[PDB]
């Protein structure tokens, strides 16, 4: 091909002699392109991810399209899929491709395709070069098959703002906002039913991007994810605790965004200069419509509170149904896990009571 920069990773497949060299946070940047690209420490791994939730009906799809290290040996590249419909079903898989190709092309297009050409199967993903719209296609025969859109919401793009999640994480937020469709066929698990998935209307999401040297345990001994629209305000937070046996700050990546303005950028999560995040779990059961994590961690929510005489805004976060639950850890009394959940919101600054819905994960490592 002409004018397109590649990087390929074959299961079993040495990557020495890859042309196209690695990099590392590229200011300003949607940083998409793969970072390790012709070496890989063997604890390296990469992240694009994509979700949508809808607020009228609370349908979601959360996607996880991965490299690492130990996958170029061993097993190939995950992409994990997780839906739930309205009426609070949910299906998940667990992919592996034993192809991983990551192209930018002479648009400035950047495409990913995770595949497997002996199952002639496949899931990938597009971005514009404006990073005004991505997409994706599934198409694994009797598994799942159809796609997903995003576009992006008018105002900030916020790529002009630190990445830096602790000292070896980088988080990116390539499309910080958007509007979100999704049509899907899910397979069951012996591939002779399906079922239409399609994600509900005034549906929010966007695209995050993700890698690190070091494996997560090394990074992080629990972790929460935010995501959510609520009324004029959108906010995205990632906030990690640092691995056992560390002296080291929570590190987060939060952004607060109004009518579409940029209005609060933390890289310090604090209690009671820079902006700053309060991120307080709870664990009472004011309303009926509450869940829990099915491990050791029983709160039912969070309270985040962002702090500019600045202007002060704070949000309730009610954890209403279950996506995922998957463990990291025997089965126990004291066993931790992977969360994924339905969130609903209300708050802002005094006297406000915007709604939302997001997305939300927490991870706790044993
Ligand atoms: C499969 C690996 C994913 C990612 C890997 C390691 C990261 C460590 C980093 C320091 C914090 C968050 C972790 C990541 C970003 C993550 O948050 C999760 C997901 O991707 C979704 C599903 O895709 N999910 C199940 C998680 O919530």
């Not at 690492?68 to 299906?91: M, P, S, Y």
């Not at 499309?175 to 899910?186: D, T």
């Not at 609060?264 to 604090?270: F, L």
Request: proline share 5%.
């Amino acid at each position: 091909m002409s004018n397109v920069t590649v990087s390929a990773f074959t299961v079993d497949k040495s990557i020495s002699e890859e042309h196209v060299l690695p990099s590392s946070f590229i200011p300003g940047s949607g940083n998409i392109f793969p970072k390790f690209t012709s070496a890989i420490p063997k604890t390296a791994w990469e992240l694009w991810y994509f979700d949508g939730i809808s607020k009228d009906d609370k349908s979601s799809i959360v996607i996880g399209v991965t490299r690492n290290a130990e996958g170029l040996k061993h097993g190939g590249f995950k992409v994990q899929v997780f839906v739930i419909w309205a009426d609070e079903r949910t299906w998940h898989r667990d992919l592996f491709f034993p192809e991983s190709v990551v192209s930018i092309n002479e648009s400035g297009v950047t495409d990913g395709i995770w595949k497997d050409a002996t199952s002639n199967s496949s899931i990938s993903f597009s971005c514009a070069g404006d990073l005004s719209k991505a997409s994706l296609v599934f198409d694994v025969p009797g598994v799942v098959q159809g796609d997903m859109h995003l576009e992006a919401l008018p105002g900030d793009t916020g790529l002009d703002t630190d990445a830096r999640l602790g000292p070896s994480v980088y988080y990116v937020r390539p499309i910080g906002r958007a509007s979100v469709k999704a049509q899907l066929s899910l397979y069951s698990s012996d591939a002779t039913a399906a079922e239409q998935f399609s994600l509900g209307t005034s549906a929010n999401g966007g695209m995050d991007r993700v890698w690190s040297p070091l494996s997560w345990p090394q990074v992080m001994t629990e972790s929460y994810y935010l995501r959510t629209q609520v009324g004029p305000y959108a906010m995205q937070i990632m906030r990690i605790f640092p691995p056992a046996g560390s002296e080291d700050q929570p590190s987060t990546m939060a952004r607060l965004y109004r009518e579409g303005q940029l209005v609060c950028v933390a890289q310090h999560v604090v209690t009671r200069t820079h902006d700053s995040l309060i991120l307080s779990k709870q664990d009472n059961s004011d309303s009926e419509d509450v869940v829990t994590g099915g491990y050791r961690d029983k709160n039912t929510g969070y309270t985040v509170e962002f702090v500019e005489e600045g202007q002060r805004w704070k949000f309730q976060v009610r954890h209403e149904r279950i996506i995922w639950n998957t463990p990291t850890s025997r089965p126990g009394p004291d066993a931790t896990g992977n969360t994924g959940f339905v969130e609903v919101l209300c708050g802002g600054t005094i006297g406000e009571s915007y709604e939302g819905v997001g997305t939300g994960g927490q991870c706790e490592l044993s």
